[PDB]
Design a protein around this motif. Structure first.
Motif, short mmCIF file in Angstrom:
data_model
loop_
_atom_site.label_atom_id
_atom_site.label_comp_id
_atom_site.label_asym_id
_atom_site.label_seq_id
_atom_site.Cartn_x
_atom_site.Cartn_y
_atom_site.Cartn_z
N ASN A 194 0.79 -1.24 0.00
CA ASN A 194 0.00 0.00 0.00
C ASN A 194 0.81 1.27 0.00
N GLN A 219 -0.97 1.20 -3.20
CA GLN A 219 -2.42 1.03 -3.22
C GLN A 219 -3.06 2.10 -2.37
N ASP A 220 -4.26 2.50 -2.78
CA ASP A 220 -5.20 3.50 -2.19
C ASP A 220 -5.27 4.81 -2.94
N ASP A 222 -3.52 7.48 -2.04
CA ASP A 222 -3.35 8.55 -1.08
C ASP A 222 -2.76 9.79 -1.81
N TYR A 239 -5.88 2.31 -7.45
CA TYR A 239 -7.04 3.12 -7.07
C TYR A 239 -8.31 2.23 -7.03
#
Ligand SMILES: O[C@@H]1[C@@H](O)[C@H](O)OC[C@H]1O
Length: 305
Positions: A194, A219-220, A222, A239
């Motif tokens: 992540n 990942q995410d 941010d 995403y």
């Protein structure tokens, strides 16, 4: 169709976009939505679910805080002819009818694929997420699916494997520092699971002058992760657009209320049954598609970059 939505926790940003898209999409499909939040509490959720069953909802949509202990309440719902949809986190050993999430295996595949796209040969460090997070193992299965032919053929050499307790950036920072020391900086790519852990690893890479030189996934999406990608210091991120997940869950919910049997990608076992599942495809974000994915979606704003 009457929908009851029992969200574990609406006190954070976590699920709030999910509620709003879900609500507005379900209504637009001609359904009434009643939403309660368990304010992080497992016993509140049991009650709010019981409340929904006693209001006469046709479909329950549950984001569980603890999905190991809703078996009786689900059974009780099924006894009344109510459909149960597990939103995002699986509900275990329960007689649910459906499960909607992103495909976490695909998250892993994406992460490893973006890395072998640029470092098809070299030294890989595997940085998994929390070893008690079942999703962490899912990302790692997807990552290993992609790596396997490269490892078995000797193009890629695994030079470490560590799981980050709590997904703590600072644990990821120490982990990376140890890996760099043990490999005398000879690490070509890091399969981080992540953005937050990638971020800690990048700080260790930066402190050795290796930033921009070592491929690293995430990942995410941010904000800070999006910035590192624009800057060249993180390779990619995955995403998982809420609006897609929330939109698709509403359509499933409504479908379920209409006796219909909605479209399922696969069948996951919850340790009582083979639950039909829509496992949405997650999005690879890199330096070239930042504007077309996370900005367009509204996830982040241009002025923020
Ligand atoms: O979205 C990720 C989540 O799926 C995982 O469980 O924990 C870390 C987050 O980065």
């Amino acid at each position: 169709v009457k929908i009851g939505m029992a969200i574990d926790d609406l006190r954070l940003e976590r699920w709030q976009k999910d509620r709003d898209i879900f609500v507005k999409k379900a209504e637009s499909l001609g359904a009434k939505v009643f939403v309660q939040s368990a304010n992080g509490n497992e016993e509140t959720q049991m009650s709010q679910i019981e409340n929904m069953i006693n209001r006469g909802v046709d479909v329950l949509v549950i984001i569980p805080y603890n999905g190991q202990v809703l078996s009786n309440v689900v059974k009780e719902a099924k006894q009344e002819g109510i459909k149960v949809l597990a939103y995002d986190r699986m509900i275990n050993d329960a007689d649910i009818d459906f499960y909607i999430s992103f495909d976490n295996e695909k998250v892993g595949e994406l992460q490893a694929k973006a890395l072998v796209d640029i470092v098809p040969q070299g030294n890989y460090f595997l940085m998994g997420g929390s070893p008690v997070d079942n999703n962490a193992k899912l990302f790692r299965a997807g990552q290993m699916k992609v790596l396997k032919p490269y490892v078995d053929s000797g193009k890629i050499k695994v030079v470490g494997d560590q799981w980050v307790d709590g997904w703590l950036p600072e644990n990821a920072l120490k982990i990376m520092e140890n890996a760099l020391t043990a490999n005398n900086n000879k690490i070509d790519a890091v399969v981080a699971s992540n953005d937050a852990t990638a971020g800690g690893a990048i700080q260790a890479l930066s402190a050795q002058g290796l930033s921009g030189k070592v491929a690293i996934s995430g990942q995410d999406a941010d904000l800070a992760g999006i910035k590192r990608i624009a800057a060249g210091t993180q390779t990619m991120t995955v995403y998982k657009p809420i609006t897609l997940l929330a939109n698709t869950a509403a359509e499933i919910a409504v479908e379920l209320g209409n006796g219909q049997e909605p479209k399922a990608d696969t069948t996951l076992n919850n340790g009582l049954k083979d639950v039909p599942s829509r496992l949405l495809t997650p999005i690879d974000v890199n330096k070239n598609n930042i504007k077309d994915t996370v900005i367009k979606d509204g996830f982040h704003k241009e002025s923020e970059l």
